[PDB]
Amino acid sequence: MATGANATPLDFPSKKRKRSRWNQDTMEQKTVIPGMPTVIPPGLTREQERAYIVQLQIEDLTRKLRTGDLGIPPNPEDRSPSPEPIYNSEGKRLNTREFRTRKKLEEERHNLITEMVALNPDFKPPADYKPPATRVCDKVMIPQD
Amino acid sequence: GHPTEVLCLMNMVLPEELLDDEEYEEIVEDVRDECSKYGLVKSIEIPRPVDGVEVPGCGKIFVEFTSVFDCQKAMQGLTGRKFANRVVVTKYCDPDSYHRRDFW
Numbered sequence: 571m572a573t574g575a576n577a578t579p580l581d582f583p584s585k586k587r588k589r590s591r592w593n594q595d596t597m598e599q600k601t602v603i604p605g606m607p608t609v610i611p612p613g614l615t616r617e618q619e620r621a622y623i624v625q626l627q628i629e630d631l632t633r634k635l636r637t638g639d640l641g642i643p644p645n646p647e648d649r650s651p652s653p654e655p656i657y658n659s660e661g662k663r664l665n666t667r668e669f670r671t672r673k674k675l676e677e678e679r680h681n682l683i684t685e686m687v688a689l690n691p692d693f694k695p696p697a698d699y700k701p702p703a704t705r706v707c708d709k710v711m712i713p714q715d
Numbered sequence: 716g717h718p719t720e721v722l723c724l725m726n727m728v729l730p731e732e733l734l735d736d737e738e739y740e741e742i743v744e745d746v747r748d749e750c751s752k753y754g755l756v757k758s759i760e761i762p763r764p765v766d767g768v769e770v771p772g773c774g775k776i777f778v779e780f781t782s783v784f785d786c787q788k789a790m791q792g793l794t795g796r797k798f799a800n801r802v803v804v805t806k807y808c809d810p811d812s813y814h815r816r817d818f819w
Contacts, residue, residue: 585744589745591749593796594797604802605795607795608806609804609805612717623725626802627801627802
């Protein structure tokens with residue numbers, strides 16, 4: 571050595587084997603395999619890109635409501651307790667938790683549905699997804715001139 | 716007609732996560748060590764809205780790769796996985812846009 575030494579701080583590369591950040595199957599045993607590429611092809615639009623991304627998320631979201639594939643909770647450590655923005659008159663005593671999770675899932679999907687339908691008018695939403703408003707009466711009436 | 720130079724990482728980062736010092740260091744570090752398994756990664760650009768400074772656009776991050784060779788063998792193995800509970804949509808990005816953070 572000539573004069574002084576600088577050396578390097580002692581730190582070995584961590585975060586290699588502890589928490590998987592590239593899983594695929596949660597809530598159950600790995601057997602249900604999603605088969606669809608995510609990479610986007612060269613020659614599209616920003617709207618269509620989302621539609622392609624969201625369609626995959628829509629099916630995977632629906633997969634989640636279909637089998638109950640949640641995996642990890644949305645909020646592990648809950649924040650300050652806060653009520654709902656939506657006004658609800660009354661709920662069921664037998665049905666509330668189940669529905670809260672499943673409906674929330676439908677809303678995630680719906681969020682994408684509304685987006686994808688806006689991005690692509692020709693988009694066909696999943697069969698289980700129903701258009702809002704139950705409507706009254708039977709069939710349509712006839713306007714006279 | 717798709718490989719450019721840098722890798723793209725979408726659908727795996729939320730603005731409510733890229734705001735904490737713990738979550739940030741967790742993503743940048745992990746994503747780095749992982750990206751450095753298929754080849755060489757120059758750096759990583761992940762937005763960090765300051766108290767909501769860069770929220771309008773936050774949600775998409777990526778890493779500056781050295782060669783499209785490893786960039787291809789990397790994204791080909793990152794597609795279909797899951798950052799936590801959502802399928803990661805990986806893609807390709809231009810080094811130019813990366814530099815300007817144009818996000819294209």
